[PDB]
Write an enzyme that holds these catalytic residues in place. Structure first.
Site, PDB file in Angstrom:
ATOM      1  N   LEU A  71      13.454 -37.011  43.651  1.00 30.78           N
ATOM      2  CA  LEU A  71      13.016 -38.402  43.678  1.00 30.78           C
ATOM      3  C   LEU A  71      13.560 -39.066  44.938  1.00 30.78           C
ATOM      4  O   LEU A  71      14.774 -39.247  45.079  1.00 30.78           O
ATOM      5  CB  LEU A  71      13.486 -39.136  42.424  1.00 30.78           C
ATOM      6  CG  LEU A  71      12.995 -38.566  41.091  1.00 30.78           C
ATOM      7  CD1 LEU A  71      13.487 -39.426  39.937  1.00 30.78           C
ATOM      8  CD2 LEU A  71      11.477 -38.431  41.053  1.00 30.78           C
ATOM      9  N   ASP A  72      12.662 -39.440  45.845  1.00 29.73           N
ATOM     10  CA  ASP A  72      13.066 -40.119  47.063  1.00 29.73           C
ATOM     11  C   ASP A  72      13.696 -41.469  46.723  1.00 29.73           C
ATOM     12  O   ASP A  72      13.602 -41.965  45.597  1.00 29.73           O
ATOM     13  CB  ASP A  72      11.863 -40.306  47.989  1.00 29.73           C
ATOM     14  CG  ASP A  72      12.254 -40.808  49.365  1.00 29.73           C
ATOM     15  OD1 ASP A  72      13.467 -40.948  49.627  1.00 29.73           O
ATOM     16  OD2 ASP A  72      11.349 -41.065  50.185  1.00 29.73           O
ATOM     17  N   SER A  73      14.365 -42.055  47.718  1.00 27.21           N
ATOM     18  CA  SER A  73      14.965 -43.376  47.575  1.00 27.21           C
ATOM     19  C   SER A  73      14.013 -44.319  46.851  1.00 27.21           C
ATOM     20  O   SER A  73      14.428 -45.073  45.966  1.00 27.21           O
ATOM     21  CB  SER A  73      15.336 -43.945  48.946  1.00 27.21           C
ATOM     22  OG  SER A  73      16.038 -42.990  49.722  1.00 27.21           O
TER      23      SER A  73
END
Ligand SMILES: [Mg+2]
Lengths: 107, 69, 217, 87, 115, 79, 125
Positions: free
Chosen positions: F37-39
């Site tokens: 999960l990216d930022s």
């Protein structure tokens, strides 16, 4: 039927026909216009090749273009003249031998 | 790449935060659309390119979520 | 004393009463809406209510290239360039859907017609929509901007070099060779300016009109 | 030219009682300062519209009520009125 | 006023017009009983060997007072079904198009600037 | 507040996000590396989580949780 | 009465998808409210347009004039312009291509608009 010179070219414009040469000439593989016209490299766009051909032949016009502030007459390279000369070289056989009807004859 | 990664995320949260205050529109469609915007563009960009995209989002926030009732 | 041109009658065989009737109506609109003093070449912002909407207002800012008309039908044209597209609207001073007229920049230009700005470079036609008004001095004379514009290639809307236009705001030296300037002078009518029966003197008419306008106040 | 012609169905927008001026829609044959003949319209639509108008004629000597200097039609926008805002 | 054989400026972002081509488009037909074309009148262009419908959005001829006179004859390309070919118009468009009898809401939606 | 309830409710909501594909949603599921999960992605987990537990969470540290256990404590100790 | 609240409720009842309602600042002289709603198919699009017009005439507007249905020749995009509201109904692909939402939300920062630059005309040498 206009390529070989059977019908007067101005009935077709000579601009929807020069494009056809580049298509079939490139499609059939006869990459001879590059050497004859000393083009940089093979291409498949009339505006580009006819830009190169026109410069090579040192031909330009004074053409009226319509911008947003009103008509202006601007010197421009002869796209029309290049199309003729590009057509007149093809028809003279110096651009190579062609078989316009291909894949229709084999079948 | 962006003006600041913190600001980038900050903008998203702010937008989504207001995302649940709309009345006359498909709340789900809002979320979905916004997600696609951020994702598709922000994955790869340059300083100038990323500056413009984040700027456009910033003005959208400061304009009643683009007048989107 | 600046008397607006529309009040000056044109010569002819029309009765003075037709003018008196119109002046009373013209003065009535001016009380409701104040029409500022402006001259050809001054930049104006006109806010008009659009009839295609629900009384919403529209704004257009441009230099007043032309002023023409008499009576309640007087008009003025003003040009601008928007996203690189020139546009001219011929407004009617007394149209009852002109909400407000603001003289953003009051000044005078070398000529009383600036139609040649159609053939000048776009820079001389573009004016900022958001520009704020510049100061003015009431107890002073209006400045006369002596700018001479530069034209684009010769094919123009009209033959501005010709002596009948009498344009004094174009840099003819740059755009035309002296041979062309000499040739264009073959259409010159030197007698026009020196025949006394062709001059319409309005001094007395202006004096009487000015008194009436102040008296109504 | 120089022929008698008639224009039909011209509306009356306003009357100026002080100067006896009638405002008639559109164009009228003749030059300025030319005398014209004015009479109720004979077109089918306005067949019996003279019910409201003074039937014999308008008598100012009668002085039943003193007319305003300017008479207007309802649609007319009078000068000195607030500027039109199609709200 | 646009007539037969007039030269026109396509003011869309559509490829048909946008692409620089040595010849401008020329009007072949004006869809009116009057041969003349004004703002809001459709016309049939001959653009790059193709026959394509279009709508006039401005012209250099004077009109009635309080309307904008443009410096070029501006035109938008519309598909046969009537949907605009291009998706954006950045040049100002007069607001008279809204009330003229016809279908102009689709074009107005695509136009950001109105004069 | 129920500590088990917070865990299962946090786990319950975390289960629903097909966006994360809960192939392995262990109580110590590393939001960043385990789930990728990216930022941006980790935030929406919070923002959506906030809705569940009456929000009131400031993102200042909510972006450092990176595991269901910590966020459980993050809310458990904040409730 | 016929207002935005009634219209959205009417659209919701007929089950349209992705209904978006964008307010327009008074500065722009187009409309108070801009409405875009997707539709399942061409048949559904015609039904929704007809129902709204039928309700519009029934719902007062006795003094207010009538509204045309535009785009019937078109098979995927129909637009109806009421006095102070404009509704555009189109299929999903047509909505995706034109992206009306982005333009009106982002007045001058639309991605497609950005690509449209300006030019001038110098001689060739
Ligand atoms: Mg001319």
């Amino acid at each position: 039927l206009a390529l070989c010179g059977t019908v007067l070219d101005h009935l077709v414009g000579e601009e929807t026909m020069a494009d056809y040469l580049l298509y079939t000439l490139n499609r059939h593989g006869l990459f001879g216009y590059v050497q004859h016209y000393a083009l940089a490299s093979a291409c498949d766009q009339i505006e580009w090749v006819l830009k190169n051909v026109a410069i090579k032949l040192r031909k330009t016009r004074k053409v009226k273009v319509l911008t947003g502030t009103g008509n202006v007459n601007v010197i421009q390279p002869d796209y029309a003249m290049a199309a003729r000369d590009f057509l007149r070289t093809f028809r003279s056989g110096l651009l190579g031998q062609v078989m316009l009807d291909r894949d229709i004859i084999p079948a | 790449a962006p003006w600041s990664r913190e600001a980038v995320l900050c903008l998203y949260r702010a937008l989504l935060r207001q995302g649940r205050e709309l009345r006359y529109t498909d709340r789900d469609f809002y979320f979905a659309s916004i997600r696609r915007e951020f994702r598709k563009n922000q994955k790869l960009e340059n300083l100038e390119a990323r500056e413009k995209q984040l700027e456009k989002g910033l003005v959208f926030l400061h304009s009643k979520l683009g007048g989107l009732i | 004393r600046f008397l607006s041109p529309e009040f000056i009658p044109p010569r002819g065989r029309t009765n003075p009463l037709k003018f008196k009737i119109e002046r009373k109506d013209m003065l009535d609109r001016r009380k409701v809406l104040p029409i500022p003093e402006f001259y050809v070449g001054s930049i104006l912002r006109v806010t008009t209510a659009d009839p295609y909407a629900s009384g919403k207002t529209s704004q257009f800012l441009g230099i007043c290239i032309k002023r023409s008309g008499n009576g309640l039908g007087a008009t003025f044209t003003l040009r601008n360039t928007i996203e690189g597209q020139g546009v001219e609207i011929c407004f009617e001073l007394y149209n009852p859907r002109i909400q407000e007229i603001q003289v953003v920049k009051l000044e005078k230009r070398l000529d009383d017609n600036l139609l040649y700005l159609r053939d000048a470079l776009p820079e001389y036609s573009t004016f900022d929509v958001n520009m704020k008004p510049v100061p003015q001095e009431a107890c002073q004379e209006v400045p006369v901007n002596k700018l001479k514009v530069k034209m684009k290639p010769k094919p123009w809307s009209k033959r501005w070099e010709r002596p009948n236009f009498n344009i004094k705001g174009i840099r003819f030296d740059l755009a035309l060779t002296e041979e062309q300037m000499k040739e264009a002078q073959k259409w010159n009518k030197p007698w026009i300016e020196f025949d006394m029966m062709r001059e319409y003197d309005t001094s007395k008419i202006e004096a009487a009109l000015w008194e009436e306008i102040e008296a109504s106040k | 030219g120089n022929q008698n012609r008639t224009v039909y169905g011209l509306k009356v927008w306003r009357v100026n009682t002080k100067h006896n001026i009638i405002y008639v829609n559109g164009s009228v044959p003749g030059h300025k300062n030319c005398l014209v003949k004015i009479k109720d319209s004979t077109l089918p639509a306005y067949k019996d519209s003279c019910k409201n108008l003074p039937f014999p004629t308008y008598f100012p000597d009668g002085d039943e009520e003193e007319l305003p200097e300017d008479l207007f039609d309802e649609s007319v926008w009078q000068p000195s009125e607030p500027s039109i805002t199609f709200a | 006023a646009v007539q037969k054989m007039t030269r026109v400026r396509v003011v869309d972002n559509s490829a048909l017009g946008s692409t620089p081509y040595h010849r401008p488009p020329r009007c072949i037909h004006v869809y009116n009983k009057s041969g003349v074309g004004k703002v809001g009148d459709q016309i049939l262009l001959a653009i790059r060997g193709q026959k394509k419908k279009a709508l006039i959005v401005g012209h250099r001829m004077p009109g009635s007072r309080m309307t904008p006179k443009f410096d070029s004859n501006n035109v938008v390309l519309i598909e046969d079904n009537g949907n605009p070919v291009g998706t954006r118009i950045k040049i100002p468009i007069p607001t008279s198009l809204r009330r003229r009898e016809g279908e102009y809401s689709k074009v107005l939606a695509i136009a950001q600037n109105f004069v | 507040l129920t500590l088990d309830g917070i865990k299962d409710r946090v786990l319950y909501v975390l289960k629903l996000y097909d966006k994360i594909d809960p192939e392995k949603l262990s109580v110590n599921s590393h939001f960043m590396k385990d789930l990728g999960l990216d930022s941006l992605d980790q935030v929406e987990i919070i923002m959506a989580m906030e809705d569940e537990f009456g929000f009131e969470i400031p993102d200042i540290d909510a972006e450092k949780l990176m595991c269901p256990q910590e966020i459980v404590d993050y809310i458990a100790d904040k409730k | 009465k016929f207002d935005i609240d009634m219209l959205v409720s009417l659209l919701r009842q007929e089950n349209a998808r992705d209904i978006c309602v964008i307010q327009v600042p008074p500065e722009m002289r187009y409309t108070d409210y801009f409405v875009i709603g997707s539709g399942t198919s061409t048949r559904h699009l015609h039904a929704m347009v007809h129902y709204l017009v039928k309700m519009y005439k029934h719902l007062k507007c006795r003094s207010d004039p009538y509204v045309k249905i535009e785009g019937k020749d078109a098979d995927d995009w129909l637009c109806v312009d009421f006095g102070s509201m404009v509704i555009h109904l189109m299929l999903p692909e047509t909505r995706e291509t034109y992206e009306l939402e982005k333009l009106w939300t982002l007045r001058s920062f639309d991605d497609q608009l950005a690509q449209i630059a300006a030019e001038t005309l110098p001689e060739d040498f």
